[PDB]
Amino acid sequence: IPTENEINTQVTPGEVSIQLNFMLKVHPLKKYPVDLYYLVDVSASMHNNIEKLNSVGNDLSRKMAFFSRDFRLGFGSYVDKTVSPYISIHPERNLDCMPPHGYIHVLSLTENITEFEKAVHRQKISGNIDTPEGGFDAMLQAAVCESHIGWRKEAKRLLLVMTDQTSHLALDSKLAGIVCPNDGNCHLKNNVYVKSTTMEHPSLGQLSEKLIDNNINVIFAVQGKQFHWYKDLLPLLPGTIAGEIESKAANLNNLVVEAYQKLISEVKVQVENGIYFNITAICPDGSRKPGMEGCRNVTSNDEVLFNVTVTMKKCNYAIIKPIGFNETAKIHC
Amino acid sequence: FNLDVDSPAEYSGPEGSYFGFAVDFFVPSSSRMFLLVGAPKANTTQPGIVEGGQVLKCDWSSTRRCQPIEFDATGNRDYAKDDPLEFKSHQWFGASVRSKQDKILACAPLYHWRTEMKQEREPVGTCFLQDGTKTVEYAPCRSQDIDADGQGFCQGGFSIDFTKADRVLLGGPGSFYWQGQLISDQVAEIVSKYDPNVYSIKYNNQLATRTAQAIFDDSYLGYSVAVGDFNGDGIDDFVSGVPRAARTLGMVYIYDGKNMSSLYNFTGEQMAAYFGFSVAATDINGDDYADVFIGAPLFMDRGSDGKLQEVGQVSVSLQRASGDFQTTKLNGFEVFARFGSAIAPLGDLDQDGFNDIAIAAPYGGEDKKGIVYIFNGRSTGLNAVPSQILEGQWAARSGCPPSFGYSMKGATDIDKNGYPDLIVGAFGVDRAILYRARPVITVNAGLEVYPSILNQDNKTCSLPLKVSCFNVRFCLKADGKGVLPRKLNFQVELLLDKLKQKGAIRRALFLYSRSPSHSKNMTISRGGLMQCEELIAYLESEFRDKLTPITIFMEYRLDYRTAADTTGLQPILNQFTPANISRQAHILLTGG
Ligand SMILES: *[C@@H]1O[C@H](CO)[C@@H](O[C@@H]2O[C@H](CO)[C@@H](O[C@@H]3O[C@H](CO[C@H]4O[C@H](CO)[C@@H](O)[C@H](O[C@H]5O[C@H](CO)[C@@H](O)[C@H](O)[C@@H]5O)[C@@H]4O)[C@@H](O)[C@H](O[C@H]4O[C@H](CO)[C@@H](O)[C@H](O)[C@@H]4O)[C@@H]3O)[C@H](O)[C@H]2NC(C)=O)[C@H](O)[C@H]1NC(C)=O
Ligand SMILES: *[C@@H]1O[C@H](CO)[C@@H](O[C@@H]2O[C@H](CO)[C@@H](O[C@@H]3O[C@H](CO[C@H]4O[C@H](CO)[C@@H](O)[C@H](O)[C@@H]4O)[C@@H](O)[C@H](O[C@H]4O[C@H](CO)[C@@H](O)[C@H](O)[C@@H]4O)[C@@H]3O)[C@H](O)[C@H]2NC(C)=O)[C@H](O)[C@H]1NC(C)=O
Ligand SMILES: *[C@@H]1O[C@H](CO)[C@@H](O[C@@H]2O[C@H](CO)[C@@H](O[C@@H]3O[C@H](CO)[C@@H](O)[C@H](O[C@H]4O[C@H](CO)[C@@H](O)[C@H](O)[C@@H]4O)[C@@H]3O)[C@H](O)[C@H]2NC(C)=O)[C@H](O)[C@H]1NC(C)=O
Ligand SMILES: *[C@@H]1O[C@H](CO)[C@@H](O[C@@H]2O[C@H](CO)[C@@H](O[C@@H]3O[C@H](CO)[C@@H](O)[C@H](O[C@H]4O[C@H](CO)[C@@H](O)[C@H](O)[C@@H]4O)[C@@H]3O)[C@H](O)[C@H]2NC(C)=O)[C@H](O)[C@H]1NC(C)=O
Ligand SMILES: *[C@@H]1O[C@H](CO)[C@@H](O[C@@H]2O[C@H](CO)[C@@H](O[C@@H]3O[C@H](CO)[C@@H](O)[C@H](O[C@H]4O[C@H](CO)[C@@H](O)[C@H](O)[C@@H]4O)[C@@H]3O)[C@H](O)[C@H]2NC(C)=O)[C@H](O)[C@H]1NC(C)=O
Ligand SMILES: *[C@@H]1O[C@H](CO)[C@@H](O[C@@H]2O[C@H](CO)[C@@H](O)[C@H](O)[C@H]2NC(C)=O)[C@H](O)[C@H]1NC(C)=O
Ligand SMILES: *[C@@H]1O[C@H](CO)[C@@H](O[C@@H]2O[C@H](CO)[C@@H](O)[C@H](O)[C@H]2NC(C)=O)[C@H](O)[C@H]1NC(C)=O
Ligand SMILES: *[C@@H]1O[C@H](CO)[C@@H](O)[C@H](O)[C@H]1NC(C)=O
Ligand SMILES: *[C@@H]1O[C@H](CO)[C@@H](O)[C@H](O)[C@H]1NC(C)=O
Ligand SMILES: [Ca+2]
Ligand SMILES: [Ca+2]
Ligand SMILES: [Ca+2]
Ligand SMILES: [Ca+2]
Ligand SMILES: [Ca+2]
Ligand SMILES: [Mg+2]
């Protein structure tokens, strides 16, 4: 009904006040600053993958700087919770390995790219027992720890998780005697996940919430058959995509760009919080889908709006977020 | 709906011991009854062991004293000089407790031993079983098949249960690269075949699952267990959750209790919902067919707005004589509350003829104190609307949330009032609470009005002048199952012509009272026929409105204080019984 002034939001209108059908215009800009964070499983099975990515990011920055005005790059490693039965707890325990660890943020986002190469080759490999690796804790930490990693409030915040096997689940922790659910807040003292042995892995609900709130788009880069695993989870984490690292590997740069042009090629909406809302799609081409399923292939230029029908039954403010975006529309008998 | 929440019995344990991580009833074969509470991180007297854990027996009557049960006062045994055999420190003893008459079985799922061939530390898990006098150890997963390739990380005792025929069922989620494993051994053999000097005891009539293909790796069979007949043989069959099976889609295996042959498979619906975290078996529709309840605490539901909300979900699968199941699902209510973390059969809580059940949301309610919902069984299945909601009364002491409801056990009548009771653990605050079932009273009320159609010019009665009059008669009887007082005191309040509010005039009043109201203390015998009482009430120059009927309304309320027993447990009225009724009267209009 009433539309706020001075816009200054990419979703139009930016604020509305209805008291009980209107259309809101989302429109992605072409040149987006980009924040790429490589979060990588450094278990044994990844020895080939680490060796590969020693000097490949240096090349990708070419394509990305061509895709994005600004481009910054960060790096962090993870393995598993450092507690039995996830690791062997013998005071010893065959080739050059580093000790296991929950998660270490090693390099904050920076434009100077050679720093990334120097950091990755300096990286070594650990090892544990159970095949799945506790990746979700690292994901949550890289998500909420905004200041430490250095996510820019303007850039498309891409978290590339690189692994080869399935990730651990929250209730898995119970085996280790860890039964205190994840609290979802940053717990890095010296760039080390100090709560790896005290809190459970984050559940998909907590992780989705933390990604959407911090506006992080996840890219699952995996190798083995477990790609399908991370693929079948995509419907549960909106604004996330998966890419298969093919056997020989080295498709990392091309994979992440193919994944990048797919979120610029999609604008999907999600509302948070007694009232029902009904959504219809308005893509460049004539297509009419429910809001939860946002248009795809969307050219960066073309406008894209959604209808909202508000019908209150019982006599606060709701928020309508286009996933992947940082600007939003707040809406207020 | 009949759980006493004003004065439940509260028990506490040492701070930081996770007192209340597992609870159970101890009922020896005509003897006193006790509570059992596990304290897995409790420090112990056994020398050189830190947070060995223990299991406390808590008195029922008089003081709420909890004394530990001595299953093993020894430290770590040595296999060779300065070569420890086992590592009881942080073994989490008491993390799994189950009782059966004189038998108490406790387990330490994080117990480690080095193995007899090399110097390692492998969490094979262990248990200690205690009957009348004897106390034996039971470690079916510490054997020759060591390391992850076998039973090295099996963590035997992660979940346990008994069968009707005194047979122990144990789950080991870490066997064969976390394919999980189930093991069933006769109590008599665990006793007889025990040997203090043999570390890998062999039991003759043992039943166990065989290692399988690698596709089943990291599935966590035995994460949770339950027992019940599901093939009509009389022998309790085995039920176990496999939360990581089917590509983290979860499953529930059911094996024949006679020879560990696969019987049935439940498969989850949502990935990573942990379908199979909790499991229970009980006949919920009184069909004498064990029904299966399966928890998925991390389930996410998509509601109106499309936003996925992690609320958890419980699947209620009713067994039918044919063999298959009639499955109905039941979502949570509060986000991140993990509805379905714990599932506890309660027996016939209200003693209505259908067993009931409790489902926990340990991380729900105000400030995440934890909640326990109660559901009543019906002929048609389970009533999906909870009849009672139990809330924790403690806040985050440190790190770990209260977790009220994470563990709980029912179906035992500890006070012997005819109704099963319930224990609820909250280990995050080191507490356990016993909620006792109040006896349910069913009340039949009657109300008659004669003559129903009044005649303004009748004027039969003589006011202590004359006025038209009629008779109002209220009857009452009550009875109930279990233990209750012989005389039940109800107070009945009657009002005349309610549809006309207080601000408006009234027309029908009582004779002896000259008032619209009538109260009466009424002492009716329990189980007898209807005690009735009738009184006269009279009714134009004082009111113009005659088109609005005259309602004669009656409400009744029993006296709880006088009906309570010696322990203070007050009776309660059936949940679905109107506390009031009404009849009507009208005036003859002109007519002729
Ligand atoms: C519920 O769901 C569960 C699991 O989801 C079901 O349980 C699974 O059932 C299947 C089918 O019955 C089981 O697979 C069987 O595997 C055996 C193999 O025996 C194993 O043990 C032998 C002793 O070590 C070993 O020799 C075998 O060798 C393996 O490795 C070699 C390679 O070296 C390989 O070539 C073999 O094939 C084996 O994989 C093996 O370790 C197999 O014999 C069974 O096959 C039958 O039918 C096939 C035809 O396809 C035939 O070729 C065989 O000869 C045999 O007649 C079968 O594939 C699986 O192990 C079970 N897993 C678990 C965890 O229980 C359960 O059945 C479901 N129940 C219901 C009611 O739905
Ligand atoms: C059962 O009994 C055991 C002891 O028999 C208790 O275990 C002790 O618990 C206390 C907690 O109150 C621990 O105190 C902490 O110690 C940390 C260092 O411990 C490490 O180093 C020792 C060797 O020096 C190792 O043995 C040990 O395993 C660890 O590797 C400190 O860093 C902690 O400091 C922090 O907390 C204090 C508050 O106490 C703050 O003031 C500090 O600023 C800092 O934040 C802390 O002091 C103690 O280490 C434990 N000992 C052992 C041997 O484990 C159990 O708690 C007890 N359990 C129950 C249920 O009763
Ligand atoms: C949500 O994200 C959007 C991003 O699209 C954001 O709006 C953008 O904010 C950035 C903030 O820097 C703007 O970028 C500036 O653009 C102007 C003109 O193009 C530049 O001159 C600015 O120069 C900066 O960068 C230089 C080096 O790169 C520095 O030397 C200099 O000091 C400046 O820091 C700067 O690049 C961008 O123009 C807007 N775009 C739009 C469409 O508004 C928005 O603010 C975010 N939402 C919230 C709530 O913050
Ligand atoms: C554990 O015990 C269960 C039963 O308690 C058992 O499951 C049953 O096994 C029997 C095998 O003895 C199965 O019976 C067979 O079924 C097939 C197909 O239905 C029939 O074709 C077979 O007929 C021939 O075999 C008979 C064997 O007695 C002959 O007598 C007959 O003349 C035929 O030649 C045979 O009847 C049965 O189907 C299953 N299931 C059930 C519900 O009965 C399981 O195998 C045992 N597992 C062990 C011991 O590991
Ligand atoms: C003016 O009002 C007076 C009363 O205020 C009224 O007198 C009534 O007369 C009838 C006879 O025509 C009486 O009828 C019986 O009354 C007793 C009450 O003591 C009832 O219990 C009787 O019903 C019982 O038996 C029935 C079997 O036939 C059952 O079906 C029923 O459930 C009862 O158990 C029966 O009604 C009546 O009692 C009196 N009134 C009173 C208060 O006693 C008079 O008729 C009115 N004026 C006119 C012109 O009628
Ligand atoms: C970008 O990073 C490189 C990598 O460290 C920096 O090169 C370093 O320069 C310092 C001098 O300031 C030398 O002491 C280091 O040995 C150099 N490191 C390497 C690996 O050669 C470079 O200075 C950085 N650029 C900016 C603008 O900060
Ligand atoms: C526009 O979107 C459609 C689907 O929404 C794309 O069609 C897909 O094309 C890719 C290869 O480009 C295939 O792998 C998919 O199987 C196709 N799916 C469907 C449903 O057709 C189409 O390619 C997009 N257009 C452009 C130019 O990329
Ligand atoms: C939204 O509209 C569709 C019809 O397009 C209808 O089926 C659905 O029930 C509506 N949702 C709500 C929450 O009203
Ligand atoms: C009488 O009971 C009904 C439910 O049976 C209830 O809705 C109503 O409010 C009650 N009336 C009074 C006066 O309490
Ligand atoms: Ca692992
Ligand atoms: Ca059976
Ligand atoms: Ca049944
Ligand atoms: Ca019942
Ligand atoms: Ca009782
Ligand atoms: Mg690995």
Numbering used by the authors:
A (entry chain B): 66 to 85, 92 to 164, 173 to 352, 356 to 397, 404 to 420, 425
B (entry chain A): 1 to 29, 31 to 465, 469 to 543, 546 to 598
Text taken from the publication that reported this structure:
Integrins comprise a family of αβ heterodimers with diverse functions in cell adhesion, migration, and signaling. However, two integrins, αVβ6 and αVβ8, appear to have evolved primarily to activate transforming growth factor-β1 (TGF-β1) and TGF-β3 and bind with high affinity to a RGDLXX(L/I) motif in the TGF-β prodomain. In contrast, the β8-subunit of integrin αVβ8 has a divergent cytoplasmic domain that binds to the Band 4.1 family. Furthermore, in contrast to other integrins, binding of ligand to αVβ8 fails to induce swing-out of the hybrid domain; that is, the open headpiece conformation.
An integrin αVβ8 headpiece fragment with high mannose N-glycans was expressed in GnTI-deficient HEK293 cells, purified, crystallized, and soaked with or without the TGF-β1 ligand peptide G213RRGDLATIHG223. The β-propeller and thigh domains in αV and the βI and hybrid domains in β8 are resolved in the structure. In unliganded αVβ8, nine residues in the SDL2 loop, including one of the disulfide-bonded Cys residues, are disordered. The β8 βI domain has unique features compared to previously structurally characterized integrin β-subunits, all of which link to the actin cytoskeleton through talin and kindlin, that is, β1, β2, β3, β6, and β711,17–19. The most striking difference is the lack of an ADMIDAS Ca2+ ion. In contrast, β8 has Asn-119 and Asn-120 (N8 and N9) in place of the D8 and D9 Asp residues. However, replacement of β-MIDAS motif D8 and D9 residues with Asn in β8 results in the absence of any negatively charged sidechains to coordinate Ca2+ and is likely to be sufficient to explain the lack of an ADMIDAS metal ion in αVβ8. The β8 βI domain not only lacks an ADMIDAS but also displays differences from all previously structurally characterized integrin βI domains in the α1 and α1′ helices and the β6-α7 loop. β8 is exceptional for lacking electron density for residues between the βI domain α1 and α1′ helices in one of four different unliganded molecules and one of two different liganded molecules in crystal asymmetric units. Disorder at this position has not been seen in any of a large number of previous integrin crystal structures and appears to be related to an unusual conformation of the β8 βI domain β6-α7 loop that makes it unengaged with the α1 and α1′ helices, as discussed in the next paragraph. β8 differs from typical integrins in lacking an (Asp/Asn)-Ser motif in the β6-α7 loop, which enforces a stereotypical loop conformation in all previously crystallized integrins.
